Amino acid sequence: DEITKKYIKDNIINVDDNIIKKKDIFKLKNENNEITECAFEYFESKKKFDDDIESRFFIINDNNYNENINLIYKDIKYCGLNIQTTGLEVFDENIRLIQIAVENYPVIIYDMFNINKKDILDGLRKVLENKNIIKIIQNGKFDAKFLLHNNFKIENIFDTYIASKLLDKNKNMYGFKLNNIVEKYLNVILDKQQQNSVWNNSLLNNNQLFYAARDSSCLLKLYKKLKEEIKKENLHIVNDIENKCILPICDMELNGIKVDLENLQKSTNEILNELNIEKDNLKKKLKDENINVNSQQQVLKALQKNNVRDISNKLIENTSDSNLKNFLNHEEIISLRNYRRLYKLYSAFYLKLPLHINTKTNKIHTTFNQLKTFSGRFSSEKPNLQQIPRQKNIREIFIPNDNNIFIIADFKQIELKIAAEITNDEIMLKAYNNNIDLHTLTASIITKKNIPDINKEDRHIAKAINFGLIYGMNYVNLKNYANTYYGLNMSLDQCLYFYNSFFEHYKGIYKWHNQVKQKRALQYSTLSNRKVIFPYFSFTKALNYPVQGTCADILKLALVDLYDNLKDINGKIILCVHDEIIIEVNKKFQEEALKILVQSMENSASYFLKKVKCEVSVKIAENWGSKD
Numbered sequence: 037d038e039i040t041k042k043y044i045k046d047n048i049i050n051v052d053d054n055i056i057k058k059k060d061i062f063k064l065k066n067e068n069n070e071i072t073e074c075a076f077e078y079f080e081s082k083k084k085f086d087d088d089i090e091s092r093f094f095i096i097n098d099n100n101y102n103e104n105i106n107l108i109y110k111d112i113k114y115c116g117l118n119i120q121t122t123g124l125e126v127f128d129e130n131i132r133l134i135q136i137a138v139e140n141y142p143v144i145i146y147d148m149f150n151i152n153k154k155d156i157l158d159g160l161r162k163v164l165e166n167k168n169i170i171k172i173i174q175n176g177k178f179d180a181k182f183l184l185h186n187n188f189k190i191e192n193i194f195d196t197y198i199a200s201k202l203l204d205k206n207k208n209m210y211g212f213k214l215n216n217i218v219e220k221y222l223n224v225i226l227d228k229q230q231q232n233s234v235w236n237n238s239l240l241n242n243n244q245l246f247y248a249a250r251d252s253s254c255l256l257k258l259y260k261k262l263k264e265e266i267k268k269e270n271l272h273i274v275n276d277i278e279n280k281c282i283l284p285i286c287d288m289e290l291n292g293i294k295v296d297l298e299n300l301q302k303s304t305n306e307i308l309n310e311l312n313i314e315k316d317n318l319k320k321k322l323k324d325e326n327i328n329v330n331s332q333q334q335v336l337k338a339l340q341k342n343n344v345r346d347i348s349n350k351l352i353e354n355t356s357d358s359n360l361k362n363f364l365n366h367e368e369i370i371s372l373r374n375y376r377r378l379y380k381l382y383s384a385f386y387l388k389l390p391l392h393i394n395t396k397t398n399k400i401h402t403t404f405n406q407l408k409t410f411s412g413r414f415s416s417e418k419p420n421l422q423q424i425p426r427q428k429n430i431r432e433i434f435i436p437n438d439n440n441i442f443i444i445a446d447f448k449q450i451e452l453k454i455a456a457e458i459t460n461d462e463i464m465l466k467a468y469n470n471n472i473d474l475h476t477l478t479a480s481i482i483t484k485k486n487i488p489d490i491n492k493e494d495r496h497i498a499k500a501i502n503f504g505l506i507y508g509m510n511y512v513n514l515k516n517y518a519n520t521y522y523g524l525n526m527s528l529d530q531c532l533y534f535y536n537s538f539f540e541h542y543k544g545i546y547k548w549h550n551q552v553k554q555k556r557a558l559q560y561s562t563l564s565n566r567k568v569i570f571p572y573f574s575f576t577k578a579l580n581y582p583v584q585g586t587c588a589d590i591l592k593l594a595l596v597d598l599y600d601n602l603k604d605i606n607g608k609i610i611l612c613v614h615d616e617i618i619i620e621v622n623k624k625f626q627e628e629a630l631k632i633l634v635q636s637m638e639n640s641a642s643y644f645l646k647k648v649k650c651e652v653s654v655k656i657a658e659n660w661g662s663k664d
């Protein structure tokens with residue numbers, strides 16, 4: 037019908053009217069700084085939405101091009117950006133639309149499925165590339181991924197989701213969407229009632245495009261209010277370091293890690309054979325064939341029937357790790373514990389990894405999130421890298437690409453140096469500037485020997501005690517923490533002595549603990565002014581938030597610097613777990629790459645920490661599970 041196809045020539049299809057062609061003159065500035073009168077084509081809704089946000093929008097394709105449209109991009113400082121994609125997998129779908137939103141102008145929309153002239157997008161390439169112009173984005177990581185994959189270079193960025201999360205101070209975990217944020221700040225309802233209609237089809241109806249436009253132009257006023265608001269609370273440093281981290285994160289996402297398929301297969305065979313041997317051995321020990329073995333209740337019943345007791349002649353009621361640690365003087369339970377370990381490992385890693393390896397590229401593309409965790413420390417998803425074990429043989433499955441070499445670098449006691457910095461502890465700094473590790477100092481004071489006389493056992497003891505007491509755990513519970521994460525059995529009197537000696541010398545830690553404990557504060561901050569509020573007091577959280585947040589800030593700045601510094605050599609950033617950064621570089625540029633990473637990490641550390649000096653270790657690794 038003519039009603040439906042009233043604008044078919046320009047790719048638009050009518051559904052419910054509410055669309056009218058309109059033409060008017062736009063007083064732009066010419067390239068020669070001359071007020072030039074040019075008439076443009078722009079659509080509008082018949083029924084005016086109750087919102088005052090801009091709804092006027094151009095649409096650009098092969099035949100509708102006007103060479104003067106790019107003049108809107110001259111002499112701007114901010115533009116509003118929005119894109120849409122048919123699906124969710126960056127490596128299986130195509131971008132559908134690009135939308136630009138400039139102040140006091142209509143939306144500029146490029147219909148990606150009808151831009152066959154590569155010359156049309158030159159202005160877009162300029163605006164994306166220019167470093168002096170800010171781009172406003174919502175969920176900027178997604179759009180940066182989709183643009184970077186498709187040969188688009190973007191330099192500046194200011195994401196609204198980051199600013200909202202930082203402003204909310206981690207009060208709540210949900211929300212932070214365009215509807216929520218616009219209703220929260222600008223006092224307007226977007227009526228986002230579109231249920232994700234199809235996008236594969238070439239043509240687009242009026243409602244889809246109008247919903248798309250309002251989602252773009254609305255970012256300008258939100259930016260104009262949010263920027264001032266963030267300036268009020270002094271969160272500009274963390275916001276700038278976060279926004280600059282979108283592009284390093286996207287590069288990390290799109291690189292991924294290769295996997296040695298052959299070695300993975302061999303490992304799977306060997307581990308399955310060992311697991312089967314262990315299962316047969318436990319079944320022989322369990323004296324049952326139909327025993328489910330995986331079934332906790334049935335194995336508990338089997339142990340009860342066998343009557344495996346404690347040293348105090350007490351029977352097992354539960355097969356948890358802590359309970360299992362108590363019962364160790366039986367071959368049966370030892371074999372059971374071996375089954376627990378082996379099955380946990382196999383099920384967690386080997387049977388689960390293959391579902392994620394992309395057949396087309398033969399890589400694992402982990403998903404990184406940046407503001408989900410309260411500490412600000414990064415996180416992984418789908419294949420969770422924090423869950424991939426640290427075993428050396430297992431970690432060898434991840435190898436660098438063909439004719440390329442890994443360069444693994446990491447800190448060492450970064451959080452301890454950060455704590456010394458923030459608390460202004462005296463002995464700690466006076467030891468660090470003499471180039472001695474805090475573990476060694478603690479071991480020396482503990483053992484009352486000289487520096488050269490400290491062994492590895494006391495070093496491990498100090499390694500435990502430092503983490504135990506720096507974050508203010510009560511003296512009683514210290515035995516459990518060492519048991520849980522180190523396994524050493526400490527005597528209560530010995531632990532009390534350790535606590536007393538520790539707090540007798542380190543005045544700074546005691547002072548900071550006393551101040552924050554008597555204060556009973558609900559708001560805390562880090563050196564990057566990253567503020568967070570707790571609903572009710574938690575001493576452990578109160579002491580743990582500042583240091584961890586600061587270390588997250590240092591690592592984030594290091595990534596941002598490394599992203600820039602490696603583009604002369606074309607080195608790619610791979611992965612970041614805890615306090616490691618891995619890069620790939622072709623072997624022809626190894627020596628320069630090591631120096632570049634050392635410089636970047638050193639400068640990033642030195643920016644915030646201004647009294648103590650951080651030292652980074654780098655090893656030219658052939659695989660992630662390299663000798664250590």
Ligand SMILES: Nc1nc2c(ncn2[C@H]2C[C@H](O)[C@@H](COP(=O)(O)OP(=O)(O)OP(=O)(O)O)O2)c(=O)[nH]1
Binds near residue numbers: 447615664
């Ligand atoms: N003992 C211990 N320290 C941790 C852990 N997670 C973080 N840390 C802190 C201090 C670590 O040096 C760093 C984690 O990276 P590392 O490569 O140093 O781990 P790791 O303690 O295994 O180093 P190392 O065995 O001495 O080569 O962040 C943990 O789970 N256990």
